[PDB]
């Protein structure tokens, strides 16, 4: 990038001009280009929102770091009817949307689904009470 | 025995159905309708696009 | 290309049986502002009635969720 030397050599020169320059003997540095993986997957199926129109989606970078921030970010949701063993009735209407990689776990689906929640509190209630 | 189950019903009732779970479902196949109303539309469809 | 077929308003009417209540003839008068107006869907969405019993559809199917 012709180093400020060089300015002091080309524009007013000192009779002594004492420049350091690199020396290569072919030149021709290597080219790179790192290898990307681009993925295509159906992710947050069925979202609560219209989401994004297409090319405005684009490519999003994702790693271990920021695997959970894709996921909250992109808010994955599942909602369905299940037929509700718990108490007799019918089918029973549950909205999951997981922030974590951790929420697919089937504790962290029992904390989500309200009704599943409250019978989980009550087993810890318990567990916890049988213990001092 | 019997008691546990009576434990359970109170515990699994009153944490089901005391707020969430708004109206829940019973028979869900009334929306078969739209069977019949796809149904038709398909029937006149088949006219509106099949004429000469 | 679309715009060749908004600018050139190509439309269609004829008389078809009714199918939905007995009846007969159903009189249908149809102008195709794009190559997707030739689909099913937009066929439906042209014709009023057609229009109404789709928009119950949408309705119903969008009732059962949420």
Redesign the interface.
């Known amino acids: 990038t012709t180093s400020s030397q060089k300015f002091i050599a080309r524009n007013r020169a000192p009779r002594v001009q004492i420049e350091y320059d690199v020396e290569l003997y072919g030149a021709e540095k290597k080219v790179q280009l790192p290898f990307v993986m681009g993925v295509m997957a159906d992710l947050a199926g069925k979202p609560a929102e219209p989401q994004a129109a297409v090319a405005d989606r684009k490519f999003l970078e994702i790693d271990v770091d920021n695997f959970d921030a894709r996921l909250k970010a992109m808010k994955p949701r599942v909602a369905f009817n299940v037929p509700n063993v718990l108490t007799g009735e019918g089918n029973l209407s549950l909205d999951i949307t997981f922030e974590s990689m951790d929420d697919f776990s089937p504790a962290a689906v029992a904390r989500k689904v309200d009704s599943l929640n409250k019978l989980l509190e009550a087993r810890t209630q318990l567990a916890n009470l049988l213990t001092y | 025995r019997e008691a546990v189950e009576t434990a359970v ?1 109170t ?3 009153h ?7 708004i109206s ?5 196949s009334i ?1 078969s ?2 069977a019949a ?2 149904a ?2 398909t ?3 088949n ?3 099949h ?1 000469a």
């Open positions: 019903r515990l699994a009732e944490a089901l159905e005391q707020t969430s779970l829940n479902d019973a028979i869900k929306e309708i739209i109303l796809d038709k539309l029937a006149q469809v006219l509106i696009m004429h």
